[PDB]
């Protein structure tokens, strides 16, 4: 049979069956409860919508994300989210399907073993291995080499991997990623005078922030411009009317991931995590991490960030080395789009943890060798 | 795009239906009086008004 | 068996069994005993004629409404008002018969305990349940959101509802309804030379509000244009002759609505309490309400209001929403069809207030979940 390729990501779910080109159903990982009273009687209204539904009634809901920072906070909620994914965006029970589930490097084991617990428990899968969000995303670009920067929504990390052999001792993973720059830029709109405070309204900067703002190639020079000309003051419509404008806005809320100072975080941007975790590894071996950096994940998406990197590595590296930022068209899908092939593949087939081996090892049996 | 407007003629056409279904339900309480005349050409009391 | 769906509203009663279109009984809300001496002997003189009765024998009545502004002030009449009701307009008797009152929003909790007490007590019905009045007209309307603004004669309220989860945080009570328009029109009526001052005349002057005044699209232009020309003085014969001639009262009567500044209220017309309740709602779910704005009440039938206040509310309203004002031609017993609706659903069948319950709890179970 086929095998259910799912992505818990934070913030967008993307699951679909392997040897295809995109996800079959994408949706945002949101769980909210409706908040007040209910009037109407019969209307048949439920105690909980997920998924896409959610966003459609988030005028009267309280949406909480179940997954915080790459690791998962609320057991239930996620339950239910898996539950959906597989009844009603797939709707193919999970009782003859292998599912290929994707976590991000250095979290918690707990969190691990409870996903394979419920994977084995609840829906009683047939078979599930468990694999490192970057990994996918190199195969997904055809390499054997080169080192990924998945920066996601939830966590960024940067996994680098020479000749299929990954370094574990060069993994550099940060926790700065799209729902902080979400954070910040809602912080900083109120100097407009715009104030967002429901979990509602984070879903409308959300969007302000993933149709406007971009990645200046020099900072300076744009915060100069902006404050002297009218040329970047770009406006957008509420859900409601009263259009906003937003200024020197639009490449400040980005620039956190270059200087994560500006929401206090001490670490250095994810232009020096990368020099860093490259200077980490062997001498002999650097020259092709630099030739074969990869971006991957949603937030890596800013127009415009593919040049301010290169132009930031190229500061810090040696001037003989050519630096090459592979900045693929499907970027957000990457990692799926790798865990299809990898699942596709005839060598990977005996893999799988089996059902078998759970039963005689217990939830422990994902560090072992099946990893 | 379908399923969203599936829904919503769904919930539009149940409650139209309970309404309607209240609506067909007792419009017979609409039966009243018209107060016709027939001239009353046949009154021929006696002036007894005791009563008032 | 069939329920009773009562609704005391403040000016006429309206009732009739569930399932209907239309209230089999609809009589004014009046008790007035007579203030003469009486000679004839044995004429069969009662001491207090309510309903419908005693709108024909006000000549020598002292009329007196016995429920002010949607609280009751005057519980003895409202007995005698419901003994008639049930007794002598629907002829059935009320231990086999549930009731549905109706009750405005934001109203004295002693007012509702007493009604609920009177109702088990005197009348000794099985089972009797207190509605909002504004959910039930919008139940009549057949949607599920929209917010409502239901003018009725004691008390104008605005209660928003989106996906059946009523806003408890947006109900705008304000208190002038039909019954300050009497008294003001009857207060301008002076300006002319036509007194009205006994409580009886002040019927008069409701039938004169009722046929002859309508609301101005533009008041500014209506009060240059009345004062040059005589197209609008629409004449009126009293119930004994000396027909009177109605010049730009006609419109400065309704008008109050708009600007209650004339009676002397500070607060905002009926054309910006709305806007406010609106925005009081989440900034996800006005659109909705944009587009759904419903009418309902007796003093919403004047003539012209449904594109007065669409205008006002364009005015307000950002440009880029579509404002659409829903005006039912049944409005005035749009409350009670909604009531009737409401009463005939089986989901519904299991929220009464069980006399047992009552018996166990005291009138305060009204409050509680029995709603
Ligand atoms: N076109 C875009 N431009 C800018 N930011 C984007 C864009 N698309 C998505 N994002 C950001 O990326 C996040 C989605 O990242 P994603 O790769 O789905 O995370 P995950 O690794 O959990 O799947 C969103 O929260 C959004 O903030
Ligand atoms: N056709 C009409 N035109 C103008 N005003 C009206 C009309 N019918 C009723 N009204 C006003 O509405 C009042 C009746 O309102 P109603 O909806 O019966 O109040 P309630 O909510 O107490 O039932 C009357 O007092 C009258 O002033
Ligand atoms: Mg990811
Ligand atoms: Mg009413």
Same mark, same amino acid.
């Given at each position: ?60 809901? +309280? *949406? ?9 906070? !609320?057991?239930?909620? %996620?339950?239910? #989210?898996?539950?959906? &994914? ?12 292998? +599912? *290929? ?9 707990? !969190?691990?073993?409870? %996903?394979?617990? #419920?994977?084995?428990? &609840? ?249 | ?52």
């Amino acid at each position: 049979t086929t095998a259910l390729v799912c992505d818990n990501g934070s913030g967008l779910v993307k699951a679909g069956f392997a040897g295809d080109d995109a996800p079959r159903a994408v949706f945002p990982s949101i769980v909210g409860r409706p908040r007040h009273q209910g009037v109407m009687v019969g209307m048949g209204q439920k105690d909980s919508y997920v998924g896409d539904e959610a966003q459609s009634k988030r005028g009267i809901l +309280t *949406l909480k994300y179940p997954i915080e920072h790459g690791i998962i906070t !609320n057991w239930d909620d %996620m339950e239910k #989210i898996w539950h959906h &994914t597989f009844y009603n965006e797939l709707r193919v029970a999970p009782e003859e399907h292998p +599912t *290929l589930l994707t976590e991000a490097p250095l979290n918690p084991k707990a !969190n691990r073993e409870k %996903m394979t617990q #419920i994977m084995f428990e &609840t829906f009683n899968v047939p078979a599930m291995y468990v694999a490192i969000q970057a990994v996918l995303s190199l195969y997904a670009s055809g390499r054997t080499t080169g080192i990924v920067l998945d920066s996601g929504d939830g966590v960024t990390h940067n996994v680098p991997i020479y000749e299929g052999y990954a370094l574990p001792h060069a993994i550099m993973r940060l926790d700065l990623a799209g729902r902080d720059l979400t954070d910040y830029l809602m912080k900083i709109l109120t100097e407009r005078g715009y104030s967002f405070v429901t979990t509602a309204e984070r879903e409308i900067v959300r969007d302000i922030k993933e149709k406007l703002c971009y990645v200046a190639l020099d900072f300076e020079n744009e915060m100069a411009t902006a404050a002297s000309s009218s040329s970047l003051e770009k406006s957008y419509e509420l859900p409601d009317g009263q259009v906003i404008t937003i200024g020197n806005e639009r490449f400040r809320c980005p620039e956190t991931l270059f200087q994560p100072s500006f929401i206090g975080m001490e670490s250095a941007g994810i232009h020096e995590t990368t020099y860093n975790s490259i200077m980490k590894c062997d001498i002999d071996i650097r020259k092709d991490l630099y030739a074969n950096n990869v971006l991957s994940g949603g937030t890596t998406m800013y127009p415009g960030i593919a040049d301010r990197m290169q132009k930031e590595i190229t500061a810090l590296a040696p001037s003989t080395m050519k630096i090459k930022i592979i900045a693929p068209p499907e970027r957000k899908y990457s990692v799926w789009i790798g865990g299809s092939i990898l699942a596709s593949l005839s060598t990977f087939q005996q893999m799988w943890i089996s059902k078998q081996e759970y039963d005689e090892a217990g939830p422990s049996i994902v560090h072992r060798k099946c990893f | 795009l379908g399923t969203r407007a599936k829904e919503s003629l769904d919930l539009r056409a149940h409650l139209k239906q309970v309404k309607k279904e209240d609506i067909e339900k007792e419009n017979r309480e609409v039966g009243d009086w018209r107060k016709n005349i027939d001239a009353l050409s046949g009154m021929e009391g006696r002036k007894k008004k005791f009563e008032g």
